[PDB]
Amino acid sequence: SSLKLQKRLAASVLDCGVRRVWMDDSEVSTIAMANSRQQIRKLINDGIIVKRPVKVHSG
Amino acid sequence: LAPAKIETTIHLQKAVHGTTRRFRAERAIKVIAAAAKKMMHTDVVKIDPELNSRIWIHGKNPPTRVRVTFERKADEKMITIASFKNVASFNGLQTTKVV
Amino acid sequence: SHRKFNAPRRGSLGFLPRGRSHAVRGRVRSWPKDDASQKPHLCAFIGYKAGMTHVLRDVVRPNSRLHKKEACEPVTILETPPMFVVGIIGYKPTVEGLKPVTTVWASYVNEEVKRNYYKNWYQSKARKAFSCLSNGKAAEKREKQLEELQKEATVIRVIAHTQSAKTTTRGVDANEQGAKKVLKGNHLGQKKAHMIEIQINGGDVAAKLNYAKSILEKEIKVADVFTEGEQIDTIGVGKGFGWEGVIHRYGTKRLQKKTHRGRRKVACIGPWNPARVLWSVARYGQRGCHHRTEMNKRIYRIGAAKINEGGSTSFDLTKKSINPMGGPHYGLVKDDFLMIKGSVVGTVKRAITLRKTININTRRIATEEINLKWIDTASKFGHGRFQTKEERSKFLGKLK
Amino acid sequence: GAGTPSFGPRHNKTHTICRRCGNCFHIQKSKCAKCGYPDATMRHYDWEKKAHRKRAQGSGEMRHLKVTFAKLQRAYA
RNA sequence: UAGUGUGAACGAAAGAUGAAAAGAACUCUAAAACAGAGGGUGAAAAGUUCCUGAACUUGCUUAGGGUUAAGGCUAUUUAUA
RNA sequence: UAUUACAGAUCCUAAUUGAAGUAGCGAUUAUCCAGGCUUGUAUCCUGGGGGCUGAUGAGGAGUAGGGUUUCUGGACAACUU
RNA sequence: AGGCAUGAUAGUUCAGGGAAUUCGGCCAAUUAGAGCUGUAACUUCGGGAUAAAGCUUGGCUCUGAUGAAAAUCAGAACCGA
RNA sequence: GAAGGUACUGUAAGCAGUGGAGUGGCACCACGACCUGUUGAGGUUCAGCUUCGCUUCUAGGUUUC
C-alpha cells in the first residue's frame, strides 16, 4: 500500500537521509509488514533495504 | 485481430519543430504514443524505460530520430509495446515488418 | 480647424468590407464591351501561380534616363495548362437583368467535371451525374436548344474547365493497355476541375454560335487567347493572414509608450454625438484573403513544354529551363506559362483567372519594346550561386 | 504600513488570566479590568447595569445561598 | 450559549414525525452504509430541523403568441382595428 | 376594544433570481516511463530517468506565540480553486 | 488535454539617422573589474579625483625574483575569427 | 527512405604525421594551445521546399427527402 513509515525508520537505523534508502520492488510485501525497528534491522542484514553509495562530486 | 511487430524510424525534429521549447521532450513521447496507436490501431500504448531514458538523455529542451520496435500483444484486448532498438546510423532504414 | 491638424484618411473606403472571400478562383465581375464585328475571340483564361523570378531587360525609351540601358525587373510566372470546353450558355436581356436561356452540353463529359457536383466522391457508389448518355433525349434536345439561342439570347458564354489529366497507378510501368487509369491531381492536390464561363466578344450572336460550337469539345491553349505585349488584368484572391490588430490592418500611428492598457490601438473610436460607432472607423478583424483585380499587367513571354529551350533567351546559345534549380511550395512547370511583369495577387498554388483589359492605354509603356537579355534560374533556398546544374560540375567537378 | 505588515510582531500578551475573575488581568498594571482585583471590593458601575448582572449573584452555583431562600418559602406559605 | 475584540464591553440563529417508533426486515442492480427499485409498517408516509407547505425561481407535460421590448383598456365572428 | 389594512422609506429580517456554465482556477523547479495497492491515481507508495533548492537553503534546531498540530491504526459527507 | 492569429505583460534584436519624440533624454542604451600611464579650473589647502583622457587583459610552453611556504608578481616565446 | 535535387553552417570525431615556442627523461620515448592529411567534411534540410519508390499503413458513426 504505502512504505512511508519504513523509509523514515530505515533512515534513522542506517544513519542516512530518506534520499539514500534503496528498497526493492520484488519484495514490497515483506517490507510493508515491518512496523518496528528490530523488524527493519533484519531486513537490512538480508540485503533487501540498502544504504546506497553517495552521488559523485570529483575534484 | 492480428499480433505483429514493426520496426520504424520516427522523425522527431519535425514532430517538435516550432513547438514550445521547454515542452519538447514531453511532446516527443506524446508523438510516439500517438504515432504508435495509429500504427497498430491500438487504444493503449506502453513505452519501455530504455526508450524513455533515450528521449530524455539530452535534457528537457530531444533526439532528432529514433528507431522503435512496436509490438501488438494481448492482455483479447491488444496492446502496443513500443521499445528501443539501438542502431549506429539511420541511412537506409525503411519501415519494415519482423518475423 | 477642429481636427487640430490635417492628415489624409487611414485606409481605403472603397474596398469594404475587409473580410474573407470563399471563392477558390478569381470571379470575374464584368467583361469588356464587345467591339461588334471582327471575330468572337475568347477573353478569359485560368492559370495557377507557380512562383517568381527576376529578369534583366534592356530598355528602349526615347527621352528618358534609361535609354539603351539594362533594367532588373521582378517577374511572376503563372503555369497555364490547356483547358477544355464543355458547355455553352445564352443570356437574354430583360428589365431585371441578364437572365439565362439554357445551357447546352457536349456529347460526353469527363469525370473531372462530375467531381464538382459532389462533396463526397469517395463515398458515392452510384456516382450518377450528367446522365445525358441516353441517346434519344440528348441528340434531339441539343438542336432544339441551339435553335432557341439564335432566337432570344444576345450574349453567349462558353463553359470550360481545367485539365487535371490522367496517369497510371504506382509501380505499374505506364504506357500499357491492361493497366487501370486514374486522375492525377494538380500541384495543389485537386482532381475536381475549376469550371468557369467565358464571354465571347464576337459580333452577330449567330456568328458566335459558329465559333463557340466549333470550339466545343476541344482544348484551348493560351497562344490563341493572349499574345506577347498584351496588357492583362489578373483576378484572384489574395494572401490570408487571419485576425489582425488596428495598427497593422489600417496602418495607423500607434500611441505613446506610456499608455495604460497598451498602445496597439486607435484611441478615439468617435465623438459623443452621434451616439454610435461609424462604419468609417478603423477596427480589429480579418486581414488578407480578399478578392481583388489588378490592371495593366504586361506579359513578357509565352511558354511551351524535351528541348527545354524555354528558359533561355535569344542570346548566350546555352539552353536553360524556366524552373529554378531545385524547383518552393510548387512544382516544375511542364506546361504553357506566362512571364507576367511584377506582382500577381495571391499565394503560390492559387488559381488566377486572367482577363483582357476593359479599356486601352495610350501611355507608351503599354506599347514598349520587350527584349529580354537574360533570366534568373537560381534556387530560392535561399542564396543561389549556380544558375544551372551544368555550371556545378564545371565549377566543382570533383567531390566525394 | 499601518495594516497587514504591522500586525506581524503581535506576539506579546497584554492581559493574562485573573485569579478572582478567572476571565484580562493587566500584567504591567497588575489589575483585573473586569473585576478590579486586587481591590478588596469587586468592580461594578451603575452605567453597566446590563454587564453587571452577568457576573452577579444568580449566575453561579449559589451553594450556601439557595438553601437560605428555601427556608423562607417554608416559614411563609 | 455559539461567536468577536489586547481590553472595558458586545451578543445571535434555532419550537411542531405519529395516538403509539409500529424509526422501514428481507431480496434485486451495484465495487459499495453511493443511489435507487421491489416488498412491508401505519387510519394516512406524515420517513427523521419529518403537521399545514403560500409566493419569487426552476423542471417535465399540454396549448397558443412572436419583424413592432412586453403589459393594459374598448370592440367583436380571437387575431386583428 | 385595539401593538387594526402597505408597493415604495439608499426601510428591517428571511429566502431567491438574471448576469452565468460566463469572469476565472493565480504565485511557487519540470516533469516522464514502468510496477505495487485499488471499482478508480499524473497526484498515494516503490524503482529508474530528467530537474530544482544550491549553507541567511521549503536543511537541522530554538525564544515569543500556538496548544496536541506530534505518533500508529482505520476513514473520505465536507475541506486542502 | 489541445491550439498559437490578435491583444496584455516580462524579455532579447533592430538598416540609415541620433532626442527631430516629449511639459521634461521619462525610459532604455553607452560606461564599468583590475594593472600601467595621466589628471584641470576652483579650494575652508583637507578636498576636487575613480576628475577627464589613453592603453593592456585570453590560451598554451617556459624563465626569473621574494618567502619556510604547496603562494603571488614580474618578464619572454608561440598560437587563432 | 533515396537523390552528382536544393539549402544553412564551415572542415565532425578518431587516427596518423622527419609538422610544432619548448620543458622533462632513457641510451629516441613522455607532455604540448595549435597546424597539415583523411575532409567543401560532419551535422541539419518540411515541420508550410521539390522530384520518384507498390518499403510500411489505412476504421467506423448519425440524421436529412
PDB file of C-alpha atoms (C1' of nucleotides) in Angstrom, chain E residues 38-64:
ATOM      1  C1'   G E  38     -39.427  -4.408  -5.310  1.00  0.00           C
ATOM      2  C1'   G E  39     -41.699  -5.698  -0.559  1.00  0.00           C
ATOM      3  C1'   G E  40     -43.566  -4.009   4.080  1.00  0.00           C
ATOM      4  C1'   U E  41     -45.229  -0.612   8.792  1.00  0.00           C
ATOM      5  C1'   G E  42     -49.436   2.946   9.758  1.00  0.00           C
ATOM      6  C1'   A E  43     -56.014   5.273   9.554  1.00  0.00           C
ATOM      7  C1'   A E  44     -52.901   8.496   6.282  1.00  0.00           C
ATOM      8  C1'   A E  45     -45.706   8.364   4.589  1.00  0.00           C
ATOM      9  C1'   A E  46     -46.617  12.287   7.687  1.00  0.00           C
ATOM     10  C1'   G E  47     -39.952   8.730   6.507  1.00  0.00           C
ATOM     11  C1'   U E  48     -36.095  11.626  10.731  1.00  0.00           C
ATOM     12  C1'   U E  49     -34.583  20.786  11.735  1.00  0.00           C
ATOM     13  C1'   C E  50     -40.358  14.880   9.298  1.00  0.00           C
ATOM     14  C1'   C E  51     -48.015  18.963  10.696  1.00  0.00           C
ATOM     15  C1'   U E  52     -50.204  22.533   7.007  1.00  0.00           C
ATOM     16  C1'   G E  53     -46.344  23.571   2.696  1.00  0.00           C
ATOM     17  C1'   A E  54     -48.125  30.003   0.092  1.00  0.00           C
ATOM     18  C1'   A E  55     -45.124  33.469  -3.207  1.00  0.00           C
ATOM     19  C1'   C E  56     -40.428  34.513  -6.121  1.00  0.00           C
ATOM     20  C1'   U E  57     -37.227  30.992  -9.104  1.00  0.00           C
ATOM     21  C1'   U E  58     -36.824  26.166 -11.578  1.00  0.00           C
ATOM     22  C1'   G E  59     -38.054  21.126 -14.206  1.00  0.00           C
ATOM     23  C1'   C E  60     -41.432  17.996 -17.136  1.00  0.00           C
ATOM     24  C1'   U E  61     -46.071  17.690 -19.931  1.00  0.00           C
ATOM     25  C1'   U E  62     -50.191  20.132 -22.645  1.00  0.00           C
ATOM     26  C1'   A E  63     -51.970  24.695 -25.612  1.00  0.00           C
ATOM     27  C1'   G E  64     -51.265  29.130 -28.257  1.00  0.00           C
TER      28        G E  64
END
